[PDB]
């Protein structure tokens, strides 16, 4: 009666059901407050204030201007998936397997090492996923935010929304090595992007080589931009990043960037 969480058809199945109780002005008003709070409470797991702002602004803009996003969010709330206000955000990264880098610790990385090797050989990669901690509290881990007005911004925004859709609809990515279908999560993310005017490349498969290479490129660039935003505080930037990646609570006020 219901499509598999992995089938393309799951996308329209959840939207139709979400439409049944649409978000009212009051509902929306409360979701704004909830989102602000969750983003605020995410600060200890994010890299800088810029990323905090971009995450917050992106979600609020999506709730505000995307019918699809509202429907997906309303579905979650009314049909026993995740309430958007429960999701917190992280910038977890991991070491790359093929990287030749002298270091073996995120904390000891440098800006030069990000720019030294191109895609394939970069030192670290973001963990992009929708997961939960031991308390079953839902989180999104995602790339640090690129610069305002960077080429990478719309794709980064689309990918952030993608991860949120995993929690909020229960939708999954394709079952295997899918080169010709996006899966329901990406379909929904792409519809949101279209409604919001976020230009992204027109891929047809979740795992087609061109998509893989694009994400890799986008992520490396976002990270390089983030590191450069904190060039003066290089050592503490990477300390904060390794700390997040080691799942420790970092300063909610971004102490490691203060004048001290």
Where does this chain bind Zn ion (CB under 5 A)?
173, 185
Residue 163 CB, shortest distance to Zn ion, in Å, is: 6
Judged by CB, which is closer to Zn ion: 127, or 228?
Answer: 127
* CA proximity to 223, closest of 59, 111, 90, 89: 111
> Are the C-beta atoms of residues 153 and 193 closer than 8 Å to each other?
no
Judged by CB, which is closer to Zn ion: 146, or 184?
Answer: 184
Judged by CB, which is closer to Zn ion: 13, or 206?
Answer: 206
Judged by CB, which is closer to Zn ion: 38, or 187?
Answer: 187
**What's the burial of 134, exposed, middle or buried (CB within 10 Å: 0-12/13-18/19+)?**
exposed
Residue 130 CB, shortest distance to Zn ion, in Å, is: 7
Q: Is 78 annotated as a binding residue?
A: no
Residue 117 CB, shortest distance to Zn ion, in Å, is: 26
Q: Is 162 annotated as a binding residue?
A: yes
Q: Which positions ≥6 away from 191 have C-beta within 8 Å?
A: 11, 66, 68
Residue 3 CB, shortest distance to Zn ion, in Å, is: 17
Q: Is 167 annotated as a binding residue?
A: no
How much helix, strand and coil, in percent to the nearest 5, is found in the chain?
Answer: 50, 5, 40
The answer for 254, left when phi > 0, alpha when psi is -120 to 50, beta otherwise, is left
Residue 11 CB, shortest distance to Zn ion, in Å, is: 13
Ramachandran angles phi, psi of 131, nearest 5°? -135, -170
Judged by CB, which is closer to Zn ion: 187, or 222?
Answer: 187
The two tokens of residue 54 are 């971009």
Q: Which residues are annotated as a binding site for Zn(2+)?
A: 162, 166, 173
């Amino acid at each position: 009666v219901a499509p598999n969480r992995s089938d393309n058809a799951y996308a329209d199945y959840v939207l139709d059901i979400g439409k049944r109780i649409p978000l009212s002005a009051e509902d929306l008003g409360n979701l704004y407050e909830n989102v602000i709070r969750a983003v605020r409470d995410s600060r200890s797991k994010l890299i800088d204030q810029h990323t905090v702002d971009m995450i917050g602004n992106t979600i609020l803009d999506a709730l505000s201007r995307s019918q699809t996003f509202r429907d997906a969010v309303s579905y979650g709330i009314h049909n026993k998936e995740v309430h958007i206000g429960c999701i917190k955000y992280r910038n977890e990264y991991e070491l790359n397997g093929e990287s030749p880098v002298k270091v073996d610790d995120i904390q000891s990385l440098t800006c030069t090492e990000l720019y030294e090797y191109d895609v394939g050989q970069e030192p670290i990669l973001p963990i992009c996923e929708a997961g939960e901690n031991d308390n079953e509290e839902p989180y999104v881990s995602f790339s640090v935010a690129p610069d305002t007005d960077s080429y990478e911004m719309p794709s980064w925004q689309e990918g952030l929304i993608h991860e949120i859709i995993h929690h909020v609809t229960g939708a999954s990515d394709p079952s295997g090595d899918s080169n010709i279908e996006l899966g329901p999560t990406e379909i929904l993310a792409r519809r949101v992007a279209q409604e919001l005017g976020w230009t992204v490349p027109d891929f047809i498969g979740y795992a087609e080589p061109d998509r893989e290479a694009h994400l890799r490129g986008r992520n490396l660039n976002a990270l390089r931009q983030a590191a450069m935003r904190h060039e003066d505080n290089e050592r503490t930037f990477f300390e904060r990043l390794g700390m997040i990646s080691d799942r420790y609570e970092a300063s909610p006020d971004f102490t490691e960037y203060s004048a001290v």
